[PDB]
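Reproducibility note. Readers wishing to regenerate the assembly model reported in the main text can use the exact inputs given here. Chain order matters: entities are listed in the order in which they were concatenated for prediction.
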Amino acid sequence: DMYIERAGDITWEKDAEVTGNSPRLDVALDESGDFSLVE
Amino acid sequence: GETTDGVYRVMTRRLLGSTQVGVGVMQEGVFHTMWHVTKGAALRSGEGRLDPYWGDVKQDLVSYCGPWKLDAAWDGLSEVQLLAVPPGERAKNIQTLPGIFKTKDGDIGAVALDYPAGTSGSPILDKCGRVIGLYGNGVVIKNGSYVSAITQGKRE
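Running the prediction on these inputs yields the following structure tokens for the assembly.
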């Protein structure tokens, strides 16, 4: 039995921690909603 | 039930203790999450019940109480923020410049941030605080790191 609990407001934060790269990937999406890499 | 707009954890008590299986967005009286988090099951909010209204396994999305309401899109140029809600941890904003998933049916923004599976459904926002999609359906690349699509629905 699943239940929900509030965790916060949805807002943009000034001076948030900035990280992560920006990869450009060739991908395929199957009928089950799974992504896979195309090579 | 609580129907105030915002980000919510999706929990279950079926397993050991109380386990966070994902996250979602309440907007305009509709709850939005990824299909793999709930498998389309009904949800509880206090003493109230939220019934599924629309869902699609291939998009990996589901809405409750009404149709999908989120329609903002990544501009393809700017940094966005993941409002990560990890299991047992406070909501925290992470800023990043999305990469891109190139598919035979068009390009989709993607974020290269790695959180536990129970973070699925956390919203990705633009600089106006609009939800441009949900985090949690993606791929594992060469180096073993996770990259999520920015998954967005269609507002009828």
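We highlight two features of this model. Chain B touches chain A through 66 residues (CB under 8 Å). The longest strand of chain B covers residues 19-27.
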